[model samples]
Target chain A: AFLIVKGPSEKDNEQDPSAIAFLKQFARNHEKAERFFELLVREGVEAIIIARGEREIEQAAKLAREKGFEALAFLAEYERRDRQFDDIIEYFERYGFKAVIVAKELKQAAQKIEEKGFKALAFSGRIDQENHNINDIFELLQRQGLRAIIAATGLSERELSWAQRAAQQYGLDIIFAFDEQDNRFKHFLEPIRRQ
Target chain B: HTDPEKVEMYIKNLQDDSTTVRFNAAYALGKIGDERAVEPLIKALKDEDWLVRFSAARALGEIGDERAVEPLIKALKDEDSSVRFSAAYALGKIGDERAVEPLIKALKDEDPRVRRIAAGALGEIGDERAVEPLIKALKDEDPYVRMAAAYALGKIGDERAVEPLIKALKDEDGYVRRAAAYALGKIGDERAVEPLIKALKDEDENVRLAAAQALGKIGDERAVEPLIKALKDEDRYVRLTAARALGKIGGERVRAAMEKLAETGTGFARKVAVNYLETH
Candidate 1:
């Protein structure tokens, strides 16, 4: 957990730099984008929404189009202030995406989806020494009966097992797709899933 | 990476009209670690832009020169906390005793960031004179400042810091408690034993891990039983640290437990046990 299992200071102000790095790597690199989409399909994720900065959102949409993945992005600031989800809800219903991946707010947006009675698996930021702590997120996931988590960054064996202990409480699954060192992303965790 | 031409160009760019160029040059000089850039960096410490000044201070620190000490001490009083933060950091890297008193004064700066770095600088300097001031900083309103002070006192390794750090083991902030636990262990005083044993039950697993480590470092028999109980901690890291602590405080009972751990434990814990057994 970035803030919980490691030390204090989770989320790192408003957004985490590691998550930004993961987003950039996932958006620009064709191989990483293709691999991530496959992992999402394996995990039963039908539609995915990313909550980050406007630039990151646009980059992700560009990648999504190239790959034919069902992806949407929103500025988290507007989501927090407007609380107007009817249009987004209508869009998902129109598309019939049953298992939606709510890629952060980790709780607020996921709660909205779960309240609407959809299977909502939350997207957590990277698992790094300083960033990813899923304490409140895991508690909320268990409360809502959410089954899995999508970690956008790499998972080292030690970090993966540590998360398993936290996830063990509610049998929550952690789904990761990449290996990250500094800002460089590679394929490690997802391949483990294939085997 | 350490090219002379590159250093000269960066040193010249420190005087550039563009703040971004000067900032980048200052940053570049630090990464270059050129002694030739030291004086120029000291001059740039007073750059018109705080960003340039901040980079210059950091550059001077990376160069690690005694010549930058007095100027960095002056920069500690800079109008911008970021510059002060970099100045304190540079002084610590330089590790000059001349900056100790000014750093102690900086420990009470208006910015908690400055205070925190000043505490770390004092630790890097490792002066006994900093011990009292740092002990006073244990009660700083900011938990980060208090945490830094605890670590600073630990680095100084003074006996007087023992009691205060023992008291800090109960600080409300888990980070501060964790640092205090580490500091007491660094001091290696038996006085911290009982309190540290109590800390093994900390709600924060990080604090508990530090307590286990400190107890092992102290190697007091009183801690042995508590650390043994810690082998069953909910957190795996805590269990491994407790096992390692028990290994450090070795006895026949500890050896037996470790042998079983090597056989039955999986992952990191088993590795810890096997390694301890091999070395012992």
Candidate 2:
């Protein structure tokens, strides 16, 4: 976590030339800041501490913590540099959200996870309101964007391995959720990234 | 468990005044498994009461006494269809080659129930001699009998039954049609290729699914086009079978079809394509 130190001023930047300049550069681009967060997380950082003031930093730290990340908020006098982002943010999009999030009982999830604001389509039974030509749900997801899925229940280790390989073939992540047990699947994320 | 005194008690009971008592005694002797019970059970097969004859035939079957074979064969013609079926069932459990021709004769038993069990009994004996008789049983008016006939022919795996089983693919009973499809696949006869392809479009999805599997097992190049077409079937199960069938009969065309799914398909079908393409 980096501290954004704000120097006392009104006319803004190019003025407070401190380590704040470096922070300012990062703060300026929302796209780059998100990319930076992505790289940091991949590198072993579990959380980020946002420093130097109100709305933006508090919201960012709260967003991270709320999403299951451990975040810390820092209150400081040396003001953090303030800047606006130029491009769209990249989250897991760098890893290419081109993925098939496999699950045991997908019916346990929704027909599509719209409430979360991310669209995921179900390729399971009678989810199709129409013809035999396709898993209409899957068809809808691609047209709307990936809610990609094919379903089965209680994946064995071998089946999980197959899903992982298929996810690899499609150049995407295979997100599967199983309760942590015996460190079997607990260490999966690390090995996946090693490849 | 084999008590000589109890055995004697049951042996005497076989001729008891009460037909039910005699029937129970006959059935008990088979479970008691005393060598002494066999001759008495065989004699019980001649009981005048139809239920007693049925019990005696089933008991002789369980006792598995070779001495009971000829008598069981004769009982196959009993006026009671129940007794006739039990006799066929007993002959099957005994599995003596001597029972084959008689069991073949019993296939023509007028009762569909007798014919069905006779079909099953012939499969249990697994005698090639029953294959022809069983093929004829495929046309039995009862769907249950025809289904059993299909299963029996599949068990027999006789090449002679393949053509008749192919004809059975159009049977009105869904179960009979499915069984016929399975039998044809199990027989793996090239003669079934074209007809089996026709069945891939059967109204019953299960029949179509079974027919697709049969075509796969037959492994005829002629199957490739229809199997590929079956990839579009509405039932996910049937589509999966078609995919595997095409994978089983790999060529550039099937691979192209799979690649097409791999490119445009999503979820399970896409993964199936990925797995099949890699494996093939």
Candidate 3:
């Protein structure tokens, strides 16, 4: 199973403007939301669960279901403020999820998952090719036993080719959920491509 | 991508029976940003479903038509807080003076989310009439609301906000403290210099970083010594920003410190020092 978590800040009632903007877009663009879920399911994701903090993304899951996707929304309520991720980790263990997709800066929760011997895949912002070579990152993800990666922005043709090489060589699934301008995205999974 | 034929179709869909269809049309029209869709999008702002209204308000903001400004100001009283939030957001995007009083009234909204966005919208409008209200908002119970108020005050750049903003530097929430520091920096008042220098020692690294940047923006020489001390902050970002702050307020002492850091400091610190020296 794969879990999707919203943020670096896990405030339960977060109503920030960015959150409001996202919900507006999500509700407005059902076509894009459906395409996103269709692709996620196509990637062989069994259950799509939103680890809730912000109420808006929880509403997102509901809207997803309304649009005909199986999205499970769950909130981890814990009295212990410091061990917020522990509650989430317990949920992960209880549900038998092996990997999670989270925002790049969720290092704390990701570290905890690795400590518990499960895989954590970070959905990162645009890869700064100068700072982070795709090959090096691919090798690191392979070494770390991560299941997949979702790039927040589009890749150049050269960068896409490098990602394809990583898929063929290391069996890593690279999903490009590019910026809003380009609605078209192609998943690079070698096995699926042959099928 | 924003071809007129499709824009016409989306405008038609604004009256679609399905809420989702209407919402999607508004979103697309906004992204396309053709002035032709502005009239229909303004009409959709009153759609029965709050979601459609929310999207319509957002779409109008993206289109940024002067015609949407009055409608958006009227949207500030939408029954749904989400709609109100989007209305304030749209008014901010439009940045018309006509929405200023409405947005100020929205600062007293029952929903903290509306209050927060209203504060931000006032900031974007940058009208002096909002200065006193924004100052009062600094005392809001919600930390985020207070933070947004501080941010708005900073954007307005009013001298009247400097003292209250200085008081906010000691806010219980670290983020509010950081916002206060950031607003003080944007205002660049001499009164804020001492408080920001004190905030450099704030427990939150984010607050410290903001204080360092604020001091640099103020460029007051009194901050020079304190900022030099910040060169050794445990957080590398705070230290690096402090080094850059010193560069902004260059002196023989600051230059000497940068040269020493260039020689003895680790990777990022060393690079920051050398680059500042070479660039300046």
Candidate 4:
């Protein structure tokens, strides 16, 4: 089964800087990290995909490595056009990233990152329009045995429902990112065993 | 309109056992602006209750008589920091230059609340003689004191304070740095441009955001590039400030960045960028 990864910004008390600081410190301190990992493990969140940025990526990587997390993936932003794609891939590799999901029209960049011997690649960003044509990308991914896909961004409710059906038809292991506040497209995943 | 009897009754209530009565009486007497209430209010300043003393000091300042100045100044030395703070604040409101030296002395008081009030009073007095003392207060150990000093410098509206206040933009405390940035903006002196630009790099996101907001308030063209760079800050608040500032200093370059952010940003960042573009 696929998993829903919450963005750091999705935390309940995200607006409070003190809480954010506490989280940052908690990740830095060993006792605090252990406590955090124990809670995550209790919650059954074994594999976490953290959003990649200078601060979040570093913090997540450190936490993941410290807790011996089974899998960790970087979610890179495609809109940062000024940043060199190769540089980001190298940076993520140095930080022990095994997989990545390029977000928002970064297919070309995602291909380049995959060339660096990453275990898996997924496409994200603005996939909710139902026009993204993920079946073709799924075919390519299936051929390479890198079949994990996360369909997030710009997703409408109807498109999200259709996406779940499509994933079922293709035997794809896919996750849908949902906006909890608006009660829109709450996260859903298809069973990987069926695929 | 000028009955001494009414003034006397208000003065009597100023010492009443009930704090609300004393506060109301002090407030009414101060608004009446009669000279007869000045002595009674000053006496009320020595009242054991902090609220009574505070109200008394406020009344004495509102009376605006020269006779109230000394008592108000003496009240600056009160044991209770809030009373002393109120007294210092009233002395400034009275606009009596005679209160300057007493206020300056109060600036060095052990209590930060007293120091903050004294700094604000000195600024309200607008005495050039207070310039050095206020500058010295810029380095006050307390963040609130430093904030008051910055606000005071701004109220003074003197070009001489531009350099020192500019340096204060890098203060570790966000509120202090914000106050300094606001003061520099109020001063509207060209010499502050470089320092304001440098403030864009402050580690505290709030400070950097405030600096960007203040620079926009100043409307100096020199702030353009710095504001643009600030648009890319990791903190959404800083980016929002930059977007608003860019909108204020609208040009093709700023417009392009604003449009790009609105078009590409997701979630809260997109909303902030779009709101800035729509409003400004």
Interface RMSD of each: 16.9, 35.6, 20.0, 30.4
Residue-level error in angstroms, candidate 3, position B186: 1.1
lDDT of 2 by residue, A1-195 (tens): 122211111221222221121222224453433332222222232232322223444344443433343222222212223321100011223211112122123233332233434323222222332112121111112112221122123445655554443332211122233322212211211111111
**CAPRI docking class of candidate 4:** incorrect
Report every candidate's CA lDDT: 0.63, 0.59, 0.64, 0.60
Q: In model 4 chain B, where is the ten-residue run with the lowest total lDDT?
A: B265-274
Q: How close is candidate 1 to the true structure, as a TM-score?
A: 0.59
Off by over 4 Å in 3: A1-195, B256-280
Q: After superposition, how far is residue A137 of candidate 4 from its true place, in Å?
A: 68
Best by DockQ: 3
**Which model scores highest in TM-score?**
3
Clashing pairs in 3: none
Docking class of 3: incorrect
Task: Show pairs that collide, candidate 4.
Answer: A128-A155
lDDT of 3 by residue, A53-80 (tens): 4333334334333323333223322233
Decreasing TM-score order of the candidates: 3, 1, 2, 4
TM-score of chain A of each: 0.29, 0.19, 0.28, 0.35
Q: Over the stretch B5-95, how does candidate 1's per-residue lDDT look in tens digits? A: 8889888998888665676677778767879988999899998777678778877888888999999999999987667877887787788
In candidate 4, stretches whose alpha carbon ends up further than 4 angstroms from where it belongs are: A1-195, B1-7, B14-24, B31-36, B46-51, B64-66, B233-237, B250-280
Overall local distance difference test of candidate 1: 0.63
**Candidate 4 residue A63 C-alpha distance from true site, Å:** 26
